[PDB]
């Protein structure tokens, strides 16, 4: 009964978490029987296209960063956090950065799972959403956030 609730946060952590989880597990956990998340469906779709693309086109960047990075425990999480902040420390923000970052994040997570290290996925999702909404929330809320991204990227696949 007090102004404070933010669907952006919940929807962000929910999507990102379910993303790395379902993507790093290879399985399918689609058992809501009540939920839907329209913006989530569209948003994810955008992430699938732009994500897969950068992964296929910029695959060299992901591999390189991971090669140098190399992670096996939550300890490095603080180091990763440092990286993120170090990149945002400049003051530049846009769909390019966000997607690029998020992408690299998921990738590293995939590897974490492949190396039997899911416990290090928690810091991954929370870290990304944390920095993004903690220091760049204004930017997201200013550009609509998720929707504005679906409009800026456009994913119309309807005929009539």
């Amino acid at each position: 009964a007090e102004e404070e609730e933010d669907e952006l946060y919940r929807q962000s952590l929910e999507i990102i978490s379910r993303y790395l989880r379902e993507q790093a597990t290879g399985a399918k956990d689609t058992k809501p029987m009540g939920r839907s998340g329209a913006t989530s469906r569209k948003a994810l779709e955008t992430l699938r296209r732009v994500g897969d693309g950068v992964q296929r086109n910029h695959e060299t960047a992901f591999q390189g960063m991971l090669r140098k990075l190399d992670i096996k425990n939550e300890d490095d999480v603080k180091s990763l956090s440092r990286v993120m902040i170090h990149v945002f420390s400049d003051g530049v923000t846009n769909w390019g950065r966000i997607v690029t970052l998020i992408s690299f994040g998921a990738f590293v997570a995939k590897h974490l799972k492949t190396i039997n290290q899911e416990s290090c996925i928690e810091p991954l999702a929370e870290s990304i959403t944390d920095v993004l909404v903690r220091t760049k929330r204004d930017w997201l809320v200013k550009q609509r956030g998720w929707d504005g991204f679906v409009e800026f990227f456009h994913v119309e696949d309807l005929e009539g």
Partner: protein, 31 residues
């Protein structure tokens, strides 16, 4: 040989850069 500090730093700058440019020209027809 290499230093996580420098590593993370270089990777970081590279990450922001890669993303900053990835928007200036989306290969997948921006869609």
């Amino acid at each position: 040989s290499e230093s996580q500090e420098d590593i993370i730093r270089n990777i970081a700058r590279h990450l922001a850069q890669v993303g900053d440019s990835m928007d200036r020209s989306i290969p997948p027809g921006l869609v």
